[PDB]
Design a protein around this ligand. Sequence first.
Ligand SMILES: *[C@H](O)[C@H](C[C@@H]1CCNC1=O)NC(=O)[C@@H]1CC2(CCCC2)CN1C(=O)OCc1ccccc1
Ligand SMILES: *[C@H](O)[C@H](C[C@@H]1CCNC1=O)NC(=O)[C@@H]1CC2(CCCC2)CN1C(=O)OCc1ccccc1
Lengths: 306, 306
Amino acid sequence: SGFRKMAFPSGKVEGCMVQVTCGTTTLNGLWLDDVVYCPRHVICTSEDMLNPNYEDLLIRKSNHNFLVQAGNVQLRVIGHSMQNCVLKLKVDTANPKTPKYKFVRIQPGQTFSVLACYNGSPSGVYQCAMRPNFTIKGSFLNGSCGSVGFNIDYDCVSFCYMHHMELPTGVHAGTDLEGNFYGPFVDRQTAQAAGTDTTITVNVLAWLYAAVINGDRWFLNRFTTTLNDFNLVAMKYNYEPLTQDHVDILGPLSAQTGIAVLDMCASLKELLQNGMNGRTILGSALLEDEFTPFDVVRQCSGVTFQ
Amino acid sequence: SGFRKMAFPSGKVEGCMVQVTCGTTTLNGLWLDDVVYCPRHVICTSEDMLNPNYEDLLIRKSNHNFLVQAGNVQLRVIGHSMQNCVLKLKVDTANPKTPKYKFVRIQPGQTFSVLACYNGSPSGVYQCAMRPNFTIKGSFLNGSCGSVGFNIDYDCVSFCYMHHMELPTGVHAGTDLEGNFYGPFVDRQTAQAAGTDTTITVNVLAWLYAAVINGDRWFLNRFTTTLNDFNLVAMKYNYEPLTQDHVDILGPLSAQTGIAVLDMCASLKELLQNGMNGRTILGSALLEDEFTPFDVVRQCSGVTFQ
Ligand SMILES: *[C@H](O)[C@H](C[C@@H]1CCNC1=O)NC(=O)[C@@H]1CC2(CCCC2)CN1C(=O)OCc1ccccc1
Ligand SMILES: *[C@H](O)[C@H](C[C@@H]1CCNC1=O)NC(=O)[C@@H]1CC2(CCCC2)CN1C(=O)OCc1ccccc1
């Protein structure tokens, strides 16, 4: 028992991280087979970072303008292209440590592990959610761009995030590995802002089931609710709507605990209306929304990866 | 910016995990050079787990009673010995993936990353503290024994914990890698219990400095306190005493923020006496004590490992 914000083991991704330098800019790249993926803002200069024209900026570059370092071994670039907001650096050596992998574009509400990196060297790993407003509340400093977010399914690394920038509220924005930003953000230093966020309702409910699986029961009640009536309360506390789909995904956890999904919605309603009154759930004094129903089942069941 | 419960990259440890089977018991071992380290309770039977005599139990074993699997490759045991509560299985093959490593026995209050494993296969990584009462609040199921806790310093893995058991409150107990339990616990199924825990004061203060570094300032005040007077308040809220040593370790963070250590103790006092009054610090509605001063500096500065 116990319940922790668990990240995936990071070894398969660590073996893929490299340093990319262009001009006076250094950041991280992701080396898979003979291609290095990194944010295209690496070709930006400190002068045109307000409204850069990246096609224009890239056609001026040569392969040798890109310094790629994998450990203490220099990778030679033999080609470059840009796909949306990511640069693809073709190198003459395929990464022998390339795991089985996929690129996936996740939905808001989904979680992933971030391997934070500086100078192509990993600093730490932590678990994130894609917020409903398409930011992530990460931990990123200067130099962390090109660090990736990912999930693992048995032996396969699904890459889902690459870090590009920090917004004025201190939250973070980035792209999928094909370079499409999550949310309305753009890779120029303009007046963007996160947009109103909401709490991921289906995840809160998952975490309440995690609590029950682990012996916290104090928040349960005998009442129930309809899905419509629950969503009327959710709206007013800035929770996102719960769909019949969400109810269905919560099926297994409902079945394991014996607590109908709508019954747990009724507990969530009372928690929203009364607060927690000095008590904690799974070591938290807030309702936690960065565990998906899948995350809860994986951790409470002991699923491994290889 | 941002502040997350960050674990060390787990790749160096993943390459060391193996499965150890003895009789009807399977758990994890740690393969470093030609030795596999695992909990000695692997030789226990479901009959004598109340008061087992492990010397007696071990002298009855042969090498071939131990099945060690590294991936899908069987490791042959050519010798065994017991050191305190860990078994050392000598195998005929040195782990080519052996990192540079040390064994260290940590003090309560110190943090480490846990690579949770089942059947020699990693499940997840998360950050822990050694509680003052020498338990850890982990996430461990059947089969997780032999999962290790660790820190990394540049290129060197310092192993500090190996998981052995779960206590009736759902918290966890284990040993250092030389098999000495942390705390008064013993590897038999008797009437042990965790003992009263306390909050790690120096770590709470570190995390308040993390908050200031990241822009949370609402909890600061103009007052100050003496170390004695602070500790009078700490005692009553079940915080452990703050020593001049702790004050000294908090030096760098004090210097970076411009907030004297005793000034931040005065904020902590008011937080203890008034609660947080609906506000959060670094996304938490509780005072967080599982970040050491070192953890804060590492994350807010961007230190990497290689
Ligand atoms: C890549 O290493 C950084 C990561 C930032 C630095 C602070 N925290 C982070 O996550 N990315 C950027 O600095 C990014 C590059 C930029 C150039 C043109 C388009 C994108 C501007 N930018 C950015 O995040 O600007 C906002 C910012 C900058 C510094 C500090 C806070 C916020
Ligand atoms: C090793 O895989 C397990 C890990 C436990 C299982 C539940 N959560 C965990 O962390 N260790 C044990 O089961 C451990 C072995 C034992 C045999 C003789 C000495 C030690 C008994 N024991 C243990 O933790 O007992 C308490 C317990 C058992 C099952 C469920 C909850 C608590």
